[PDB]
Amino acid sequence: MASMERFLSVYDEVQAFLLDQLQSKYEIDPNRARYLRIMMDTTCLGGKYFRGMTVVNVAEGFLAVTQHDEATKERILHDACVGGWMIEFLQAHYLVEDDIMDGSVMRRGKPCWYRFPGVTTQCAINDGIILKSWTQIMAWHYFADRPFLKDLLCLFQKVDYATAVGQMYDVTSMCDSNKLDPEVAQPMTTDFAEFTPAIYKRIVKYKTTFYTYLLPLVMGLLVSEAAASVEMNLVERVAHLIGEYFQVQDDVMDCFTPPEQLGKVGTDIEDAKCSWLAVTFLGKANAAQVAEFKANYGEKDPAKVAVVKRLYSKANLQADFAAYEAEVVREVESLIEQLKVKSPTFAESVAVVWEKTHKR
């Protein structure tokens, strides 16, 4: 059975289980069950399932080289699908809440969930909470008897926490750290001294890399009972490298990819985000260019946004991106070679993850 069809079939199974349990144990009525079914479909479906399918693909790699009964292969693949959906539902939680936090308009070609007429922010904040709860309901039901349950839940909660910490780093990245204060309204930085590579790398590591790359790779190892057969420091290092490249791509697309293709209007400039474009521009600009950037960044005024995008263009940041990409290729290939010492099979799964990321 092809992997994607198995993954989608398991979605239907998990949805049916969750909604039936709401009826049998939480006294839910049919109309609220329908609302939650639509909420689940709208928030969890429609992406590429990169994260969830990485769990399945890692598990498939070990199945190809490991002796198992057929029923065990089926069990492991079912577990990989459930675990993949745990990650997809975690992402769905963060996208629902982040779109509210940021006042976002569109996602995946459609209105953000909180903007649906019958949802509103009052319901959507709680819907996001339910999405996160469902990740745990899934795990306890499907993995109740599994040897990896404790490790999986502990990993999942640390990744969730890291992601929340990363969200804090992201939403505060345009303020001066020494002025953070719940009592005082926060002004945007004027000096942009905290727009550095090291600070950017911290934002991305926590806000994206743990849940997008580390969690799927390690969950795939756990459902395969294969974690002891890799060097976990290498898994972390390669996750944090590929995840950074993934975010840099997304940063470049926020500014330069046409909205029809991105699925939304990018607003990183207006939001004064610490993006790869802004850090790299500030790393090569002259004084006059720095001053013009400062005079126009972080403003909803479209003329000011056009100034910034013009500065980025004239700064030939496409050349910095090519240099950055070539260095990532060097380092990822090096880490893949190191992974081969202990697990050639896992190294190949990582190579696939990199290829998919590099060519998306």
Place this chain on the structure above:
Amino acid sequence: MASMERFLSVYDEVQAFLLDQLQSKYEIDPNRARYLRIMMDTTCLGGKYFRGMTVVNVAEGFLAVTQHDEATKERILHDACVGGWMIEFLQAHYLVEDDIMDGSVMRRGKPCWYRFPGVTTQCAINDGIILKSWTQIMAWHYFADRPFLKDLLCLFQKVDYATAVGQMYDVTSMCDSNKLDPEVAQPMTTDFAEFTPAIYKRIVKYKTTFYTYLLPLVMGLLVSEAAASVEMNLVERVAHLIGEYFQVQDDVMDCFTPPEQLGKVGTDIEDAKCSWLAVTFLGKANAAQVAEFKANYGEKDPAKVAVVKRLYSKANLQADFAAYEAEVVREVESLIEQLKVKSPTFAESVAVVWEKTHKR
């Protein structure tokens, strides 16, 4: 050592552990650590600690009748304090998010967290997420080696999920169920047919009773390794009775307790909430009174709110509350007697919980 001082000392310990770990493992800087320290204090402190201290008091009851080394007594009480703070932090999560969802102005005499000038909704939604994450970070750290970890985490997540489901029941309680639809903006009910005792009881059971009464009582049993020594169906039944009374009190206070004493301005009438007052009024009103209620309920117009409060007064609902209270006393005393068959010690802890609730 008095119980409350132990509980407050453990708060300081848990805070220090969480903030130190953010520094040592999550690369946090001092100013963001300070922001999170202030957020923790502002959202988690200042209440009565009823829920957290119930864990401690249940554990203390078993310590008085169970043979243990002194070091074991200290361990059990420390665990009860950590578990109590898990519940207090869970409540803090829900209060932060609910105040945003509802547009609330004040809580506990102070502005709601999202209204602090240096917070804003963008940060406060994520701060609430962090509060919930911290409940799990606490558990995994302090309870790593404990026999009750699996049961405790499974109970905690089911109670969390129930609470989110209850929030859904609450925020949708003024709409007609058959018209719920993410695609269509939701009108307030005109017939109030779903303002019934059974529907009210479902809202309260899920939104309040599981985390306010069931979770502290059972967590106290788990850290005492005493759950097998009670009839769990009775624990559930008595939690759902006392929790309903607690909410009915809060509903009456929303309408009639002066804001200086309540800590906020009550808005249940303007918000068209399915409150005990509205259900009980609709259960005894004549046709003309029903019509006047319908013409004025669910409106921010202060004159319409005064109409409703006048209808409540003239309806002598204080007599319904006295009748309701007398019936709760009958049923709680009956359940306490039944709890004595297997655990006279636990029955006494429940009697204390009831006394504190009844007299607050």
